[PDB]
């Protein structure tokens, strides 16, 4: 599963 944190922009995966 991929996601982008809406605060830092950090991504767990692309």
């Amino acid at each position, epitope marked *: *599963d*991929a*996601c*982008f*944190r*809406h*605060d*830092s*922009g950090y991504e767990c995966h*692309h």
Partner: antibody
Amino acid sequence: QVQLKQSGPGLVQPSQSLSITCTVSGFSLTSYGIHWVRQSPGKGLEWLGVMWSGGITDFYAAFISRLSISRDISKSQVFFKMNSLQADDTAIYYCARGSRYALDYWGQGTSVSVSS
Amino acid sequence: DIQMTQTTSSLSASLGDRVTISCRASQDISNYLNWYQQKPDGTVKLLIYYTSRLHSGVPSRFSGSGSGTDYSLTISNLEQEDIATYFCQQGNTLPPTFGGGTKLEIKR
């Protein structure tokens, strides 16, 4: 209380720059991202860019050359400048706060018109 | 880009109805989906995030469901102040994309 207050004029002359200051309170800009979204009439919500919490910015591809996003931490302000507006830019321009998952708190909007 | 598609633009409802607003993404977004509410006055509010989690302040008649491509915002026992446009938004891959929107309207 979490709040986002937009200042800056609605009216931009053609080929002139749209400037919107997004002033915030009751949260830290160090800890949250500020996203810049617009809503053309009838068309949907359009993401334009973001000042991430860390201080690095990102943009939608189609606006890369037109946008500037700076911030001032001590003032609690993030700043938005888009260049060379035409009529196809007529929209409500939103600054919105990003948390972990979503855009959880939104500016009142800025109704933008393009006319000479 | 992930395409977000709310296949109905206009939605005809009656006060007290259970309304379901529907949203399809171009790929699996693995439950990373937010629902927003835009009023006629232009104020925007987050309703729910990560498919089904209610934001602080949001009444309990607002629920979410879905996995993979297809997601739903359901408003049980619909009220007058719930008459607005509703937008889905994927949080899977940049850039953030939203659906076209579904505007609520009164059936007569």
